[PDB]
Design a protein around this ligand. Sequence first.
Ligand SMILES: [Mg+2]
Ligand SMILES: [Zn+2]
Ligand SMILES: [Zn+2]
Ligand SMILES: [Zn+2]
Ligand SMILES: [Zn+2]
Ligand SMILES: [Zn+2]
Length: 185
Amino acid sequence: HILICCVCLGDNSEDADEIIQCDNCGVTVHEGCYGVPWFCDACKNGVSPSCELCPSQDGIFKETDAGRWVHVVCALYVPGVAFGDIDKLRPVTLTEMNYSKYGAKECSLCEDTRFARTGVCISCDAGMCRSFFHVTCAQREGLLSEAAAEEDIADPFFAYCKQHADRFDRKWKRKNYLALQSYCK
Ligand SMILES: [Mg+2]
Ligand SMILES: [Zn+2]
Ligand SMILES: [Zn+2]
Ligand SMILES: [Zn+2]
Ligand SMILES: [Zn+2]
Ligand SMILES: [Zn+2]
């Protein structure tokens, strides 16, 4: 039986890193992708949160220092976020620099036009490409990648626009993203 991690879109639930599921909302995540009857952090606080950095209300969230909420995935890809905090079991810390970026760019991938200028966009990482999108909008299109440990890249999290993406990687990531809705309550 194949569950999908809503952070990395992988499906391997081995011995060390199992894919656990929130018993309240049904969200599924690698232990290792979340810092880990089990509740996700949002359900432990009885909230269905919105992300400070994107318009998506799906996926899994962590609390910030100031009492707000962000996607784990948005924390991994927005520059200037110390995302190793959740591994250390401490809140996401957003800086003045992060806050000053809200609404600065228009997301080119937004399904709902009303939200294209909300939150914080990332850009394509190929050459000097300047295509902007929310982290979760890129996630939906299969555009978020994590380099393997052996690749020895200091920031292993990167994203490519549709024109520059690995087509194979997009295909199975888009497929696994779509399958996530099937596991929800
Ligand atoms: Mg980064
Ligand atoms: Zn994962
Ligand atoms: Zn939950
Ligand atoms: Zn988000
Ligand atoms: Zn968007
Ligand atoms: Zn590009």
